[PDB]
Amino acid sequence: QYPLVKDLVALKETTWFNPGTTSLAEGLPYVGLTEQDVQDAHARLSRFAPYLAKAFPETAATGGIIESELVAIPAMQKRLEKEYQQPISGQLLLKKDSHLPISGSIKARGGIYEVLAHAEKLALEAGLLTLDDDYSKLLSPEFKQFFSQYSIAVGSTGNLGLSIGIMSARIGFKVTVHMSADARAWKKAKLRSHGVTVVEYEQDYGVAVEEGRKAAQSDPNCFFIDDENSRTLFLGYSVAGQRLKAQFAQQGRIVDADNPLFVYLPCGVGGGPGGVAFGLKLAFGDHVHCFFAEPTHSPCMLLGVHTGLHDQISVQDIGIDNLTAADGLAVGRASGFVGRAMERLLDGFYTLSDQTMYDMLGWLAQEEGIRLEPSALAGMAGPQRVCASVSYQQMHGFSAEQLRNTTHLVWATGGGMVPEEEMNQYLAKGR
Numbered sequence: 001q002y003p004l005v006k007d008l009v010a011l012k013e014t015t016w017f018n019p020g021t022t023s024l025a026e027g028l029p030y031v032g033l034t035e036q037d038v039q040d041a042h043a044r045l046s047r048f049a050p051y052l053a054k055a056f057p058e059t060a061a062t063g064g065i066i067e068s069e070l071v072a073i074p075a076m077q078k079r080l081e082k083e084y085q086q087p088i089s090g091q092l093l094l095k096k097d098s099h100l101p102i103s104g105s106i107k108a109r110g111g112i113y114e115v116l117a118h119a120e121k122l123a124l125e126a127g128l129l130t131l132d133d134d135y136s137k138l139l140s141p142e143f144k145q146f147f148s149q150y151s152i153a154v155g156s157t158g159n160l161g162l163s164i165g166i167m168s169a170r171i172g173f174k175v176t177v178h179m180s181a182d183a184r185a186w187k188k189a190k191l192r193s194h195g196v197t198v199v200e201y202e203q204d205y206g207v208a209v210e211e212g213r214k215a216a217q218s219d220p221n222c223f224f225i226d227d228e229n230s231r232t233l234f235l236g237y238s239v240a241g242q243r244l245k246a247q248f249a250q251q252g253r254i255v256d257a258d259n260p261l262f263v264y265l266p267c268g269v270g271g272g273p274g275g276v277a278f279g280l281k282l283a284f285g286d287h288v289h290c291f292f293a294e295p296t297h298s299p300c301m302l303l304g305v306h307t308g309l310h311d312q313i314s315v316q317d318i319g320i321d322n323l324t325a326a327d328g329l330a331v332g333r334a335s336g337f338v339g340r341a342m343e344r345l346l347d348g349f350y351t352l353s354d355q356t357m358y359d360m361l362g363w364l365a366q367e368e369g370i371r372l373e374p375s376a377l378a379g380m381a382g383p384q385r386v387c388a389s390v391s392y393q394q395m396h397g398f399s400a401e402q403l404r405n406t407t408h409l410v411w412a413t414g415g416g417m418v419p420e421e422e423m424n425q426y427l428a429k430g431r
């Protein structure tokens with residue numbers, strides 16, 4: 001076998017288990033954020049819940065908590081064991097962030113949160129709002145006019161654009177989304193139907209984000225959503241940790257030393273999976289084990305963490321084209337901060353090809369009736385990478401029994417809003 005980086009260079013599916021993981025206590029100083037920060041995010045989303053229930057009536061029945069289902073997928077589990085000839089110990093579950101309301105992706109967590117935090121900040125500073133107000137008052141025509149004086153910009157592939165576009169437009173902000181090549185036509189149409197300005201290019205994610213950042217700095221009433229650097233996005237994602245813990249409790253599922261939880265997180269820039277992993281660590285401690293999953297054509301986070309260069313190296317530095325069917329994950333350079341903040345708290349990083357993603361996407365639809373976009377399948381290959389590795393199991397001291405009592409949680413990150421035509425194209429690609 002090649003050394004790891006040569007696998008990367010060759011676009012071979014590969015797996016790196018992190019030999020420098022630490023206890024939660026030993027890792028926490030390096031995060032730069034705390035459980036108090038995470039609880040402040042929960043509290044902010046709770047303050048906005050009465051606004052959201054009215055602004056987006058699809059959330060009224062939970063109102064307006066933005067949360068997704070946690071489901072068991074034992075038919076898919078058996079299918080994976082059949083197709084890849086590797087047993088999956090324990091139970092396989094799926095977290096359906098693909099089916100979050102409003103924008104149908106994990107970006108409905110961090111993207112939406114960042115937009116709400118920005119509105120709140122402006123409204124507070126204007127003297128228009130206090131923390132103990134009923135936030136549904138923000139729906140008033142006066143508030144919409146207030147927010148119309150401010151603009152938001154974002155670069156995206158873009159579930160992020162979709163999330164920040166739809167939320168910002170509903171609030172009353174002017175919003176422009178700078179879209180990478182190609183970004184799906186349906187997403188641009190969807191944004192334009194919400195009164196969002198979209199600016200189309202023909203370079204990748206990093207260029208779109210760069211040009212979007214440039215345009216927002218030209219105006220003190222324009223706020224750039226910076227997915228490479230925003231801790232606010234990260235915190236919006238991290239809210240998922242306690243939400244999941246509460247679901248596990250409700251469902252009567254134990255997470256402890258004897259019943260470990262392994263979580264498999266698709267990774268673009270790292271804010272999404274990093275933020276979720278942080279919230280998970282605070283919720284479950286040393287008993288949750290987190291794995292990032294990237295396309296073979298975009299292994300930016302694995303590359304950054306493995307080499308210790310983080311955002312100082314890109315996939316293109318190693319001759320990789322950053323072209324993948326997994327749009328949400330087609331990020332060529334890791335986060336400005338997530339790798340350093342989180343490496344001690346991440347058990348491993350792996351890559352999988354577009355074809356693997358497409359094959360699994362079809363199997364999931366066949367076995368479970370759940371239809372996702374290719375990006376959302378990246379975690380699905382994780383349980384078998386982990387179960388096959390004797391060295392990973394020995395590294396962490398996992399017994400046969402602990403492995404039988406493991407929960408494997410695949411984090412689905414997008415797909416619920418993909419139109420039938422595009423979904424049928426996805427299904428046509430798998431074998």
Ligand SMILES: *Cc1c(COP(=O)(O)O)cnc(C)c1O
Pocket residue numbers: 105106107159160266267268269270271272273328329331373375376413414415
């Ligand atoms: C945002 C996104 C991810 C993870 O993205 P990050 O850039 O790491 O935050 C994964 N899957 C989908 C479908 C996404 O939209």
Ligand SMILES: [K+]
Pocket residue numbers: 267268269294295298299300301329330331332
């Ligand atoms: K990536």
